Amino acid sequence: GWRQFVSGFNEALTMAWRALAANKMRTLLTMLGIIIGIASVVSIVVVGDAAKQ
Amino acid sequence: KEGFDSAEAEQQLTRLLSLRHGKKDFFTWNMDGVLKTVEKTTRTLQLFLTLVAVISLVVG
C-alpha cells in the first residue's frame, strides 16, 4: 500500500533526521560535497550563458 | 627578432620614418602585441577552466 509508503516518507523523514543526528558532522561534509557541486553547476551555467548573451 | 617587444621600436621606427621621410606618413599597424594580448586571453581561459575544474576535483 502507498499509505505506508508516504507514511514511510515522513516518518522515515524523521528517522532520517535522527540518523543524521547520529552523524551531523559526516552529514555536514557530505552535504557540503553536494552543495559546492550543484552551486558550481548553476553558477557556471548561468555565467556562461550570460557571457554568451 | 630578439624576442623583442612590438610595442618598442615601432615608435623608434616612427621617428625613423619621420626622419628618412620629411613627414610622418608610414602609419603602420602594430604587430605581435595583438598576439600578446590574445595569448594572455587564451591562457586566461586556460586559467579559468583548469582552475575551476581542479577545484571541483579537490571538492571530489
From Swiss-Prot, chain B:
Coiled coil (UniProt feature): none
Compartments (UniProt record): Cell inner membrane
TM spans (from-to): 47-60
Q: How does it assemble?
A: Homodimer. Part of the tripartite efflux system MacAB-TolC, which is composed of an inner membrane transporter, MacB, a periplasmic membrane fusion protein, MacA, and an outer membrane component, TolC. The complex forms a large protein conduit and can translocate molecules across both the inner and outer membranes. Interacts with MacA.
The family classification in the record reads: Belongs to the ABC transporter superfamily. Macrolide exporter (TC 3.A.1.122) family.
Entry function: Part of the tripartite efflux system MacAB-TolC. MacB is a non-canonical ABC transporter that contains transmembrane domains (TMD), which form a pore in the inner membrane, and an ATP-binding domain (NBD), which is responsible for energy generation. When overexpressed, the system confers resistance against macrolides composed of 14- and 15-membered lactones but no or weak resistance against 16-membered ones. In addition, the system could also transport R-LPS or a similar glycolipid.
The molecule here is called: Macrolide export ATP-binding/permease protein MacB
Report the source organism. Answer: Escherichia coli (strain K12)
